[PDB]
Design a binder for this molecule. Structure first.
Ligand SMILES: CCCCCCCCCCCCCCCCCCCC(=O)O[C@H](COC(=O)CCCCCCCCCCCCCC)COP(=O)(O)OCCN
Ligand SMILES: CC(=O)O[C@H]1C[C@@]2(C)[C@@H](C[C@@H](O)[C@H]3[C@@]4(C)CC[C@@H](O)[C@@H](C)[C@@H]4CC[C@@]32C)/C1=C(\CCC=C(C)C)C(=O)O
Ligand SMILES: CCCCCCCCCCCCO[C@@H]1O[C@H](CO)[C@@H](O[C@H]2O[C@H](CO)[C@@H](O)[C@H](O)[C@H]2O)[C@H](O)[C@H]1O
Ligand SMILES: CCCCCCCCCCCCO[C@@H]1O[C@H](CO)[C@@H](O[C@H]2O[C@H](CO)[C@@H](O)[C@H](O)[C@H]2O)[C@H](O)[C@H]1O
Ligand SMILES: CCCCCCCCCCCC
Ligand SMILES: CCCCCCCCCC
Lengths: 158, 240, 457, 144, 240, 48, 48
């Protein structure tokens, strides 16, 4: 927990692109984490700040960093409908089949909130469609329970 | 008679009756009002581009306009000419009997699965020594959509299949009641029938209503428009 | 402290703050009432207040040992602190009335946008205000930011499969982790509450969730891990509403040299280019100004008319009143000089002081003009003759009242003890105003009277 | 108790706000719903308004909303008070020999001091800084 | 008692042994809430936030509270102490005293100035009588208007003292002048002297009323403060 | 004026014989034909 | 209902009475709690 690490966390959250740029120059710790285990990349992925996601990965940020419950920046981006960040994270080597402590993947989260574009991108980068969570549920099981017609057609490719 | 005291004394007595009343009557909300019997004005609301139905307009009025008018000083009573939306679960008895279910099962599941749970905190007071984490726990929250009500799991069968609420009922947003339906010059409308509070000034209250409506107009949807089909106040101003 | 910080962390800072006041301000501070858990902006584990009580005014001599001085030293000393915004400040004269400086703005969700889009609109407004330091300073939210929170999902199917009721789940969770008020009991003839809650050690961290069990229909005990899943999200620890709609209160003030009315006129402009369905309103101090703004001139417009009309009736002349009325600035200039010299403000004590200074100078002028006029009207004397005889007669009573009244308020000017702020504000504006009103009126009133009578033959 | 800010807002605060109708001389209404399970709705009235009438009218409209609030909130109770935040003094009560906790002191003051101060001539209102005792059952999940 | 709650029966096992509440839980008299930790110079604390009753004397009440706390001293347990971190009464006692000193000192200054110029004990008594009469009288009018003795109304009189002193001085001086210049006896001199100024003094009252009375008609919180000074100054000036 | 109304008698004995609760009968009849306000939900931020 | 005078006094009468503080023009307060559960608390005010 350095002095500049806390300022990078707060800046990455708020989307202040100019303050992140300066903190990258001064060597602020890109792997600094909250009490809950969230890096600046988690925070940028959650709140949907694209430029900062790209800046942090240029400066050697852990693209597969995991919080205290197993969730990655890809989990957060896929769940909250940030297509551009999903593509960027996958492009920089993000584990598309990453499982949190519940067995939940980015596909499950993307499916559950009907983010059609993201589900296709995840599939294109090699998302396991048959991946089950702790309750045995695939992304397909989620789509039929939610009653999503269009999503069920895409995921029915066993 | 001081109407403020009349309301207090009446309501002091009503409070003794309240516990004796049925639970369902208490939950609809009993109201004590001090107003004139006649309408001060009717504030009509239409959609000039035909983009919203009678039901959509009435809900908009109920959810975005009525409460602020009701809180305005001098407004004794506000009658909505229409109904606010509610989540309508329209049950099917054939499909209910098919899965060995009743309206009692539907009601229990809606209570269980459309719930807002108070769950406490991680690292809450009184804490152990050396705690670093403090964070609210969020469990079930109220449902927000027909889709979420639709996927309320009523039961799981012997063979493993799921009986959702949408399998035994049509689910839609619709009026609390369907009794009041209004029109303005033939076209769909809603509105607010406003009654003057006992002893208040008609012209000042009207002015306050027209001021409060002006604060709402900028944030209307496309086509929604206020019309003024009935107002007792302008004659007072013109005759004087 | 920062968001997510614990009670213990806050206590350490309050202990450090208390340790400062009892060591470094040992001669001034009598006590420090530390209150961990409460802040005006929003209560929580990560906030607190220390109410510092001082020794008697006799034991704290000179400006160096006053609240002003001790505040500055404490605030400067507490700028060092390990990640914690800690600062001392004096109470306002009327705590009932609040602080009352600047403006109080409300940003309003007018179309069901929700918390997150209202936050974005608020940030858009704050960033725009920051680009006008010439007009607006310290434009900030009077509220809390979003914090991490632990979202737990009860799986309904798995709960129904294992035969665990949802009521038993949600009661087990809430009662243990949140606490539950069950019923009352009677401790020594007094009715008191009974709470059930988890012992601290079993409700601290996410791993403790799995240690809680619930009985199923068949009899077997099932752990929370069996039928739940969890994850981190962000949410509000303090949701605000204004006139029934979701809101976010924004405090701020006008910049040095600018009036609050200008700053308000800008915030309205900056608000009008916010996203669709985001409105605004003025509350508190700003609501009262926005409604009752045009009164100050409109009232004294009538005052000036009534004064003129009264003097017109007294003197039986539409013109002669002007000779009296022209006295008003003669007192006001000295008040403004004495205030500006000492670095005091245009406050209510000063303002009421002006009205008393003006009224007494007006009274002096009225009698000078009255005497002069009677000499002209009854004794048939000339303008200059009557004016010179009038001011001669009135010199002594004018000088006597002024000598007494200036010496009477002299202690209120020099006063430095308890309640001296108000005494200074009363005294200086009266003294300085009386010095110029006395000196100038004796020479200027005859000028006003003569000039007016010549102008209107 | 144990409620997050949203739970408080959506089960308590909104329901009360929706029922604040037909009350005379209201300028504006504001509210806060927070993660310590607390809600505070302030209703500010026009100058010259009778404070007692203003209070009873608010109190009466709340009473009729009470059946709509949750069981746990009804049980705790919803307090309607005039917001005349201006203390005459604060009497502190402390323990020098380390024998009493703040909870122990607060209960002593509740039981042996508060009432007598409330009955003292010229005293308008008295606030306990803390609570009287409560029977705490601290549960053990391993034993359960 | 904690013992009785401990003995609560949760279940009876098959073998015979009883599971009581004390087996599965710690039991103690604690606080209702644990969010606030209050300390006073490092030591645990509680306290009473006392507010003044409507129309009550703040100084009497403070003395009365301290008197009741004294009666409680003997029965406290070991270690318990009363402390007074916040108390407005010391401040209010000073504020009133300094205003009372100024009003008395103002009257002696007028005595010193009156004697310095007019040079007889007889004339210098006349303001010394007349000013207290007007000051006392103002309190009667404050009482009639439902006003209290407070910081604002007291400084209202301090600001008014110049106007009160002037009425006394103007009347006496003008008799002393008319006696010196024309040689008339005191009774005839006073009739002539008051003839010169009585019309003016009535005009001055009206003019000064017009300066101060509008200050009472400000709205809101600022106008409530301005109204304290307005009524006090208009009353004092009108009696004078 | 008075109007035709559909009077229905629940046979208590026959109900007790079949093992059907009178509360389940009245809830079923009332909820289906009259309507039943179950609880609240949130529609675009507003309690309904 | 069913509560003795002492239980009623402790749970109702004193609880109400300790909140009857700082009411305007209160001369005196009297009350009683009885074996049928009944509480009566009478507050008499200044003349006028
Ligand atoms: C907005 C809402 C409405 C609010 C209402 C506001 C009302 C305010 C009250 C205003 C009343 C003013 C009335 C004055 C009218 C002028 C009358 C003067 C007549 C005049 O000319 O005087 C002559 C001698 O000159 C002289 O000796 C000079 C005397 C005249 C001085 C003129 C200046 C008047 C100043 C009044 C305005 C300022 C007020 C505020 C400070 C001879 O007289 P004559 O009758 O023989 O002449 C007729 C010739 N054939
Ligand atoms: C000479 C002097 O010092 O003033 C003393 C003397 C004092 C003016 C007193 C306040 C008040 O009783 C005064 C009145 C008008 C009270 C009413 C009548 O009965 C008068 C016959 C009486 C004469 C003067 C007196 C007795 C003083 C006070 C104020 C006391 C109050 C506080 C809060 C300290 C004071 O000490 O300042
Ligand atoms: C030359 C005439 C000039 C006019 C002067 C006008 C005087 C105005 C001064 C304020 C009058 C009231 O001031 C009166 O002071 C006494 C002080 O003994 C107060 O008395 C109170 O405070 C004192 C001092 O702490 C306590 O010890 C006492 O138990 C309590 O009763 C009264 O509550 C108050 O009513
Ligand atoms: C709506 C009500 C408010 C309206 C405003 C009124 C303002 C008037 C201010 C007071 C003026 C008093 O009025 C003034 O009185 C003095 C005496 O006292 C009169 O003066 C005269 O008095 C008598 C009158 O018989 C004469 O013998 C004497 O020679 C002369 O001095 C003036 O002729 C008159 O103008
Ligand atoms: C007729 C001479 C006496 C007139 C009275 C003058 C005093 C008026 C005071 C006005 C206060 C509002
Ligand atoms: C002597 C009358 C002074 C005028 C006061 C102004 C009153 C304004 C009320 C609207």
């Amino acid at each position: 927990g350095s002095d500049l690490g806390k300022k990078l966390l707060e800046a990455a959250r708020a989307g202040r692109d100019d303050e992140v740029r300066i903190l990258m120059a001064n060597g602020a710790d890109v792997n600094a984490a909250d009490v809950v285990g969230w890096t600046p990349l988690h925070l940028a992925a959650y709140w949907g700040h694209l430029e900062i996601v790209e800046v942090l990965l240029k400066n050697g940020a852990d693209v597969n960093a995991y919080d205290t419950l197993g969730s990655t920046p890809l989990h957060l981006a896929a769940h909250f409908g940030h297509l551009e960040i999903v593509e960027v994270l996958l492009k920089n080597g993000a584990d598309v089949n990453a499982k949190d402590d519940n067995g939940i993947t980015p596909l499950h989260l993307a499916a559950n909130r009907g983010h059609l574009e993201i589900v296709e991108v995840l599939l294109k980068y090699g998302a396991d469609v048959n991946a089950q969570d702790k309750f045995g549920k695939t992304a397909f099981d989620i789509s039929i329970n939610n009653g999503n017609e269009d999503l069920a057609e895409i995921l029915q490719k066993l | 008679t001081d109407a403020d005291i009349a309301q207090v004394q009446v309501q002091n007595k009503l409070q003794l009756a309240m516990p004796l009343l049925p639970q369902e009557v208490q939950q609809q909300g009993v109201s004590v009002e001090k107003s004139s019997s006649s309408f001060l004005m009717v504030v009509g609301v239409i959609n000039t581009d035909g983009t919203m139905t009678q039901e959509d307009i009435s809900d908009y009025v109920a959810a975005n306009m009525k409460d602020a008018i009701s809180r305005t000083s001098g407004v004794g009573d506000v009658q909505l000419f229409g109904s606010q939306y509610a989540m309508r679960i329209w049950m099917n008895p054939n499909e209910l009997n098919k899965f060995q279910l009743t309206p009692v099962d539907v009601i229990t599941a809606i209570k269980a699965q459309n719930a807002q749970v108070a769950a406490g905190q991680l690292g809450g007071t009184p804490p152990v020594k050396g705690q670093q984490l403090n964070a609210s726990i969020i469990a079930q929250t109220r449902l927000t959509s027909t889709e979420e009500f639709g996927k309320i799991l009523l039961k799981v069968n012997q063979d493993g299949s799921r009986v959702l609420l949408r399998d035994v009922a049509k689910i839609e947003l619709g009026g609390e009641n369907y009794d009041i339906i209004a029109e303005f010059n033939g076209q769909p409308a809603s509105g607010l029938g406003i009654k003057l509070a006992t002893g208040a000034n008609a012209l000042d209250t009207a002015a306050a209503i027209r001021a409060e409506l002006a604060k709402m107009e900028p944030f209307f949807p496309s086509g929604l428009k206020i019309v003024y089909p009935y107002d007792t106040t302008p004659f007072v101003k013109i005759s004087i | 402290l920062p968001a997510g910080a614990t009670q213990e962390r806050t206590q350490k800072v309050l202990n450090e703050v208390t340790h400062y006041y009892l060591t470094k301000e040992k001669n001034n501070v009598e006590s420090v009432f530390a209150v961990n858990g409460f802040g005006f902006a929003g209560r929580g584990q990560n906030t607190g207040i220390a109410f510092v009580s001082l020794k008697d005014w006799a034991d704290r001599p000179g400006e160096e040992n006053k609240v002003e001085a001790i505040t500055m030293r404490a605030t400067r000393a507490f700028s060092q602190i390990k990640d914690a915004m800690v600062f001392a400040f004096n109470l306002p004269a009327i705590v009932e009335l609040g602080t009352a400086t600047g403006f109080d703005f409300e940003l309003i969700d007018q179309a069901g946008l929700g918390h997150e889009k209202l936050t974005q609109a608020r940030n858009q407004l704050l960033a725009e205000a920051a680009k006008h330091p010439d007009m607006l300073t310290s434009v900030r939210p009077n509220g809390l930011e979003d914090t991490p929170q632990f979202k737990i999902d009860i799986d309904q199917e798995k709960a129904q499969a294992l035969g665990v009721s949802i009521n038993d789940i949600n009661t087990t969770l809430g009662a243990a982790w949140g606490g539950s008020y069950v019923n009352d009991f009677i401790d020594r003839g007094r009715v008191k509450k009974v709470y059930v809650m988890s012992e601290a050690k079993y409700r601290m961290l996410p791993d403790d969730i799995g240690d809680w069990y619930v009985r199923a229909a068949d009899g077997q005990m099932v752990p929370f891990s069996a039928f739940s899943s969890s994850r981190w999200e962000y949410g509000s620890p303090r949701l605000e509403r204004y006139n029934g709609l979701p809101s976010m209160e924004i405090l701020g003030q006008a910049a040095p040299g600018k009036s609050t009315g200008e700053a308000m006129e800008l915030m309205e402009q900056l608000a009008s280019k916010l996203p669709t369905g985001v409105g605004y309103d003025w509350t508190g101090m700003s609501y009262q100004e926005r409604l009752s703004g045009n009164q100050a001139p409109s009232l004294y417009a009538i005052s000036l008319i009534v004064v003129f009309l009264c003097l017109a009736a007294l003197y039986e002349s539409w013109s002669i009143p002007f000779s009296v009325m022209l006295v008003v600035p003669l007192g006001v200039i000295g008040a403004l000089l004495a205030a500006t010299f000492r670095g005091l403000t245009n406050d209510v004590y000063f303002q009421v002081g002006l009205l008393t200074t003006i009224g007494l100078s007006a009274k002096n002028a009225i009698l000078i003009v009255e005497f002069a006029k009677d000499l002209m009207d009854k004794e048939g004397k000339g303008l200059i003759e009557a004016t010179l005889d009038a001011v001669r007669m009135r010199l002594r009573p004018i000088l006597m009242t002024s000598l007494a009244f200036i010496l009477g308020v002299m202690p209120l000017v020099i006063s430095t003890g308890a309640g001296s702020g108000a005494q200074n504000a009363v005294g200086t504006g009266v003294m300085g105003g009386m010095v110029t009103a006395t000196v100038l009126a004796i020479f200027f009133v005859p000028v006003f009277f003569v000039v007016v009578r010549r102008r209107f033959s | 108790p144990g409620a997050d800010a949203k739970t408080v807002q959506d089960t308590v605060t909104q329901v009360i706000e929706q029922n604040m109708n037909g009350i005379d001389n209201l300028m504006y209404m504001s509210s806060n719903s927070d993660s310590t399970g607390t809600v505070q709705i302030t209703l500010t009235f026009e100058s010259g308004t009778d404070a007692d009438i203003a209070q009873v009218q608010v109190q009466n409209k709340l009473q009729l909303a009470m059946p709509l609030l949750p069981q746990e909130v009804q049980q705790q109770g919803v307090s309607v008070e005039k917001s005349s935040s201006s203390f005459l003094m604060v009497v502190g009560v402390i323990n020098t020999d380390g024998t009493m906790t703040q909870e122990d002191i607060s209960d002593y003051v509740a039981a042996n001091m508060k009432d007598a101060i409330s009955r003292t001539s010229g005293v308008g209102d008295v606030q306990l800084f803390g609570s009287q005792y409560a029977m705490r059952i601290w549960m053990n999940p391993n034993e359960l | 008692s904690t013992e009785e709650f401990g003995k609560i029966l949760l279940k009876v096992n098959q073998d015979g042994s009883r599971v009581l509440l004390r087996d599965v839980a710690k039991i103690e008299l604690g606080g209702e809430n644990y969010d606030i930790i209050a300390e006073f110079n490092g030591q645990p604390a509680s306290g009473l936030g006392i507010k003044l009753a409507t129309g009550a004397n703040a100084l009497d009440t403070a003395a009365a509270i301290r008197a009741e706390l004294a009666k409680m001293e003997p029965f406290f347990p070991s270690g318990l102490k009363i402390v007074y971190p916040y108390d407005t009464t010391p401040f209010v006692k000073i504020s009133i005293h300094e205003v009372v000193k100024t009003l008395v000192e103002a009257i002696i200054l007028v005595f010193l100035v009156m004697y310095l110029f007019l040079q007889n004990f007889r004339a210098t008594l006349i303001p010394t009588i007349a000013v207290p009469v007007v000051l006392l009288g103002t309190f009667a009018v404050l009482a009639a208007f439902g006003f209290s003795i407070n910081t604002l109304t007291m400084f209202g009189m301090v600001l008014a003292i110049g106007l009160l002193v002037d009425d006394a001085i103007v009347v006496v001086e003008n008799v002393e002048r008319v006696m010196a210049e024309e040689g008339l006896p005191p009774k005839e001199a006073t009739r002539k002297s008051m003839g010169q100024i009585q019309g003016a003094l009535v005009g001055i009252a009206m003019v000064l009323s017009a300066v101060f009375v509008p200050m009472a008609f400000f709205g809101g919180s600022t106008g409530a403060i301005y109204r304290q000074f307005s009524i006090t100054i208009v009353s004092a000036m009108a009696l004078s």
